[PDB]
Design a protein around this ligand. Structure first.
Ligand code: ZN
Lengths: 339, 48, 248, 94, 108, 196, 122, 48
RNA sequence: GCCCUUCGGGGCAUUUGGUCAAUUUGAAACGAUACAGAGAAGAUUAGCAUGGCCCCUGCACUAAGGAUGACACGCUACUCAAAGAGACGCUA
């Protein structure tokens, strides 16, 4: 039998975080909001929806600055460059567009995806964008020459998520074939495969200060440690298709569930300090309750969620909350926890 | 080294290798063949 | 970036001027484009520009020089080596399977994956234990010249399959000019047609109805030339016994 | 036999060597595992053992992969790192 | 020499194991060298063939029981018959009232 | 040979047309088994394993097809590969212990069960291992299996199973020790309140 | 070497001792006349299905390879390898002892060529 | 079927007429194993 | 050949060329001819896709066509049982 640790320090005691509450709901999109991108100076954010428009909203007012057209299918990705005045969109129409924000016009196309594109990440230090789609491939594109410099193959399902970080593993692709692949960017080779999830991996995120990441499939979130992909912990209790995941600079994991569910977790301990259920915009069906995309702003004080009732919901953490009003209900249980 | 029977030590060689002059007008010489995909890398254990 | 070429294919000059052409030709085995290295042989001022005929991967699979396509351990052709040593020939020889195997194995073939030595000794030991009413003795009428001057043929019986035609030809070349020599090893028959009757008469005089060529006993007679047709196994056996009985 | 001496005793049996090992004292050719008249000619894998001592079965999961490839192939990979026995301080810094 | 036979102070033959190679053939690298006899391999092949013949017998019995025309006919083909049987097996508990209405030739 | 070529062409065209249907691979491999082309059938099954790596049915049929032609070592390598790829499918483990119990080889079955118990399975595999060791005498080794079982599955049901086993095959002091260890462990992990 | 004339069919199979002579004859007699105005179809022969011809060709391949191996190996080495000579057999028994009696050294160790081998080497 | 009976009838009548179904764009399935994937070796020797 | 010279001698110039010219036997493509005859559960039909060891035309390998270009329409045991009676009989 593999030995466990009986020190009772393997379970960190959760830090206290205030609960989150609804602040805003922004209408105007005529499709499910599936993209969201806060610009690096925290002034505006970018929503892409099923009405194939990209809308630029002021973050402070929630007030519609601009609408950009040019896609013909649902916008799935969006990225405001911190080093260039560029925005990056991908869609279900196989198009990966680079928008010049100084002209509000599409200036580049990154062509080569055989099907609709679901994800798009900018490399934090290199001049590279990464897309994944329904063709089972993560395309790694050079920004300047529009050249598909890497074809990351090995997944047998739709590549649904992807993260770029500055150290190896530089690409992490979660796919609907229930596997997660860790990719060395320099060679285009799989460093590792994680097959712990039973269902299609739909959400990934990386921690801002720790060298760890998290993956999420239905009913299960798993925290892993880079660069070896060692299984760190489970986030448990969100029995839904999890589309999204948002960790904060203050260690908050946000899982949004396709049935309209929400879980706010403490990152280090795995404790669920909040469990919410979103509400639908009037006129919606019960089936239209669902958080389809989410992000934090650069401050981390606002959670932006795009939801399948075509809405934008801003969430603030409660300023009138103290550790006495919302006590941590976690105890160091002594259970085998059959793995 | 020694090859084709005999095992006498042949003198070592200095070889000048130059790229061949190619006709600038020559089109591509060979057709492109559509070979099916090879098998993938050996799949990992399923850690459910 | 360097060919694998044997010494006898390389020039006698220790200083080799070599041309290199990326994708200059398709390999003569797998039909893939490969870097061709070429050089001028010791036959100065006319001949053939010697070159690497096969690619390096096929040269690792066959263990052969890229120019001559012979075995780089004994100097034998690849098929001769494979038939006489019973080797695996590690790779498909079909059309599409060749590119499939080369596409999927080019990194392990380079490292020597996917040494005969002992099988050569096995072949040598196997060839060590190789295992490959009678008519009266010939009277004088067999080698006496007939009265008919038109009779020219010399009939030989008792020929085994191990005896080539050329040994008979230069055994009978010392007696005169041979117009024709027909050797049928299937029927153990032979016909010698000279140009002058003096040579055939000398052959009958110094053969005297008997001959030994390379340890094979044969019987010689005068004969008018008749064809050899589809002939019975028992008759073949009895004149083989007669050719053995040429030396009682 | 013990070893203050072994002269005058020839190994005649395959079990005369104990488990095995030819005796240097006897100046006769000795075969602890019989005739190697034929080669090994076996396509099996090299059987290894782990630290505590059991047959190591990670050569099957790692078959066809390089050494830098990360492959999870045991139940120990399903345990959290904090609870994973020989695990004290874990460095979680960029 | 792996197993050690000792006549103890009670006069009984004990057999202690230095390694763990005797109990389970883990740590015993000669687990590959086990060769099953002819009878056991024949038993295994016979049992696998018995499972095969059971599968053929069940297939034949299912086809024979599906080859009976007991009841009202609605289909036109064999696949149509199987699909209509599946439609029955799901939709009787929701559509028996409609079937009653069809049988009577009157009220819903 | 014309019939073989036409059947191979038809099977390969069905495989190229729809490779995600297991019936084409199964039919091609079974047919090539029928003309005793074992290398060809092995190649077809391995290509199917390249298309369907984690299919338990394909693994089961390929181990069975290897076994019914009396290729024991091939099929044991195949079962090692199958329990390496899918360690959480109890069907493959159950077939593997059943096959190496059918062929004699009780220490081999024991080491396969030891690997399975290393993977910490459900209670059914522990009960199967205890039944294996109880069938061929060997009660003390079943006692260590109950020790590992009560570590892995520390429910009162497994402690009562150990109590019944030590009642039938051991002294009453062993039963008292088993009950005392059960109540002590459940008192120190679920607290003094949650003893069953 | 051997001409087998399959008469009645009008077909013959000429086997020269040299391959270059065979190619020369094929390129010389193609579309020629023998005695009357005919066009000869001198083409490359396939393989004689006669098992006697098959074993003849297989054997000839085997002594061609044996000639190459005998050229490769030293004369004493090959003379011990066949062992048809009894004196060579006695030399193998006496030489492949190296002090230890009852050895009869393996062919990998005895018939080995190199600077560090333990043999007269080469 | 009709080609089979006429081939058998002409096979009985002495001559051995060669039958060819080698169209262009066609792969050979009888020469070697198509896309041969040998089984992975394990701990058990399988050469016998 | 020429140049230099202390007539002893020395200097300048330095290895081309994947091509047999030679069409039967180192590999072109049809058409005519005969034959079959354009998909969506009655008949007649506009289409757009999907999959790749199927292509053609095209600069288009980020058009549009080639009958919606053709092709697909097949074949079908195996992760595989449990009951409670009765019973030629087995058997405790
Ligand atoms: Zn050469």
């Amino acid at each position: 039998l593999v030995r466990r640790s009986e020190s009772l320090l393997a379970q960190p005691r959760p830090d206290w975080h205030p609960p989150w509450k609804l602040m805003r709901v922004i209408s105007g999109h005529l499709g499910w909001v599936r993209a969201l991108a806060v610009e690096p100076n925290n002034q505006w954010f970018a929503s892409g929806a099923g009405d194939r428009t990209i809308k630029i909203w002021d973050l402070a007012s929630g007030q519609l600055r601009l609408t950009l057209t040019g896609h013909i299918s649902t916008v799935r990705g969006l990225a405001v460059s911190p080093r260039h005045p560029y925005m990056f969109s991908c869609g279900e129409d196989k198009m990966v567009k680079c928008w010049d924000l100084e002209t509000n016009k599409v200036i580049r196309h990154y062509h080569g995806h055989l099907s609709g594109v679901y994800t798009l990440k900018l490399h934090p230090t290199l001049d590279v964008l990464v897309t994944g789609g329904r063709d089972g491939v993560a395309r790694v594109w050079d920004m300047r020459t529009r050249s598909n410099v890497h074809v990351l193959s090995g997944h047998t399902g739709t590549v649904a998520d992807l993260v770029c970080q500055e150290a190896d593993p530089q690409v992490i692709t979660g796919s609907l074939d229930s596997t997660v692949r860790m990719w060395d960017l320099a060679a285009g080779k799989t460093m590792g495969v994680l097959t712990h999830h039973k269902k299609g991996v739909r959400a990934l995120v990386t921690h801002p200060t720790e060298f760890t990441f998290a993956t999420a499939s239905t009913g299960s979130i798993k925290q892993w440690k880079c660069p070896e992909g060692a299984f760190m912990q489970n986030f448990e209790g969100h029995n839904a298709i999890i589309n999204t995941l948002a960790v904060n600079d203050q260690n908050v994991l946000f899982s949004g569930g396709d049935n309209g569910s929400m879980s706010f977790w403490d990152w280090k301990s795995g404790y669920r300090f909040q469990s919410l259920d979103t509400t639908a915009q009037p006129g919606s069906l019960d089936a239209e309750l669902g958080i389809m995309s989410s992000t934090f702003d650069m401050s981390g004080a606002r959670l932006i969620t795009g939801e399948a009732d075509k809405t934008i919901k801003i969430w603030k953490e409660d300023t009138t909350a103290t550790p006495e009003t919302h006590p941590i209900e976690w105890k160091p249980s002594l259970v085998r926890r059959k793995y | 080294s020694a090859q084709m029977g005999n095992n006498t030590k042949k003198q070592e060689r200095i070889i000048k290798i130059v790229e061949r002059q190619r006709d600038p007008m020559e089109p591509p010489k060979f057709k492109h063949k559509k070979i099916p995909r090879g098998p993938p890398s050996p799949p990992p254990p399923v850690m459910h | 970036d360097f060919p694998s070429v044997c010494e006898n294919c390389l020039p006698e000059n220790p200083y080799v001027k070599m041309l290199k052409e990326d994708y200059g030709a398709e390999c003569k085995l797998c039909t893939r484009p490969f870097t061709v290295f070429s050089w001028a042989g010791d036959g100065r001022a006319h001949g053939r520009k010697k070159r690497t005929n096969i690619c390096l991967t096929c040269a690792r699979l066959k263990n052969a020089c890229q120019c001559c396509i012979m075995d780089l351990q004994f100097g034998l052709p690849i098929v001769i080596r494979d038939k006489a040593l019973e080797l695996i020939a590690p790779g498909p020889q079909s059309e599409i399977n060749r590119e499939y195997f080369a596409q999927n194995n080019e990194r392990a073939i380079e490292e020597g994956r996917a040494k005969t030595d002992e099988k050569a000794r096995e072949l040598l030991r196997r060839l060590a234990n190789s295992k490959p009413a009678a008519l009266p003795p010939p009277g004088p009428k067999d080698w006496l010249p007939p009265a008919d001057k038109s009779i020219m043929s010399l009939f030989i019986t008792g020929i085994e399959d191990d005896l080539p035609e050329w040994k008979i030809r230069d055994f009978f070349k010392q007696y005169g000019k041979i117009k024709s020599l027909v050797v049928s090893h299937m029927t153990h028959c032979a016909f010698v047609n000279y140009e002058t009757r003096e040579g055939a008469e000398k052959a009958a005089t110094e053969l005297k109805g008997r001959a030994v060529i390379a340890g094979c006993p044969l019987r010689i007679r005068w004969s008018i030339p008749r064809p050899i047709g589809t002939m019975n196994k028992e008759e073949r056996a009895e004149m083989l016994r007669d050719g053995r009985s040429a030396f009682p | 036999p013990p070893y203050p001496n072994r002269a005058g005793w020839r190994p005649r049996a395959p079990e005369d060597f104990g488990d095995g090992g030819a005796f240097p004292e006897i100046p006769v050719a000795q075969y602890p595992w019989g005739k190697n008249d034929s080669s090994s000619k076996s396509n099996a894998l090299v059987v290894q053992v782990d630290s505590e001592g059991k047959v190591d079965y990670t050569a099957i999961a790692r078959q066809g992969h390089s050494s830098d490839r990360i492959i999870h192939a045991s139940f120990k990979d399903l345990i959290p790192l904090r609870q994973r026995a020989e695990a004290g301080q874990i460095d979680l810094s960029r | 020499g792996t197993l050690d036979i000792i006549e103890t102070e009670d006069g009984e033959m004990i057999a202690v194991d230095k390694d763990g190679t005797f109990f389970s053939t883990a740590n015993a690298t000669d687990f590959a060298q086990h060769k099953p006899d002819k009878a056991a391999v024949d038993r295994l092949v016979a049992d696998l063939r018995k499972a095969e013949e059971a599968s053929l017998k069940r297939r034949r019995e299912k086809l024979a029981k599906s080859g009976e025309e007991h009841g009202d006919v609605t289909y036109i083909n064999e696949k149509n018959k199987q699909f209509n049987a599946k439609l029955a097996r799901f939709y009787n508990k929701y559509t028996a009232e409609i079937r009653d209405s069809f049988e009577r030739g009157t009220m819903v | 040979k014309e019939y073989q070529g036409r059947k191979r062409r038809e099977f390969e065209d069905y495989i190229r047309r729809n490779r995600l249907r297991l019936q084409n691979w199964f039919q091609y491999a079974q047919w090539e088994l029928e003309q005793k082309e074992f290398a060809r059938a092995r190649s077809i099954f391995e290509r199917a394993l390249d298309v369907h790596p984690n299919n338990t049915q394909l693994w089961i049929r390929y181990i069975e097809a290897e076994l019914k032609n009396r290729n024991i070592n091939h099929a044991r390598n195949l079962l090692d590969r199958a329990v390496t790829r899918l360690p959480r499918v109890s069907k493959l483990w159950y077939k593997y212990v059943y096959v190496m119990e059918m062929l004699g080889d009780i220490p081999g079955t024991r080491q396969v069960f030891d690997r399975w118990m290393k993977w910490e399975p459900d209670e059914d595999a522990w009960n199967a291992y205890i039944k294996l060791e109880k069938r061929y005498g060997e009660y003390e080794r079943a006692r260590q299996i109950f020790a590992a079982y009560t570590q892995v599955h520390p429910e009162p049901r497994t402690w009562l199973k150990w109590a019944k086993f030590e009642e039938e095959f051991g002294t009453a002091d062993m039963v008292r020790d088993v009950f005392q260890s059960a109540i002590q462990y459940i008192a120190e992990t679920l607290g003094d309140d949650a003893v069953d | 070497e051997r001409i087998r004339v399959l008469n009645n069919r009008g077909v013959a199979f000429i086997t020269y001792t040299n391959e270059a002579n065979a190619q020369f004859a094929k390129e010389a007699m193609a579309h020629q006349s023998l005695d009357h105005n005919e066009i000869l179809n001198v083409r490359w022969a396939t393989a004689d299905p006669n098992p006697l011809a098959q074993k003849r060709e297989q054997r000839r391949i085997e002594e061609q390879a044996a000639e190459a191996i005998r050229r490769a190996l030293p004369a004493e080495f090959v003379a011990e390898i066949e062992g048809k000579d009894p004196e060579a057999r006695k030399r193998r028994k006496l030489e492949s002892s190296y002090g230890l009696e009852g050895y009869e050294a393996p062919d990998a160790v005895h018939f080995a060529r190199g600077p560090n081998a333990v043999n007269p080497r080469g | 079927l009709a080609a089979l009976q006429k081939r058998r009838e002409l096979k009985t009548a002495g001559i051995n007429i060669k039958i060819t179904t080698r169209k262009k764009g066609q792969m050979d399935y009888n020469a070697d194993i198509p896309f041969e994937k040998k089984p992975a070796p394990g701990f058990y020797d399988t050469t016998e």
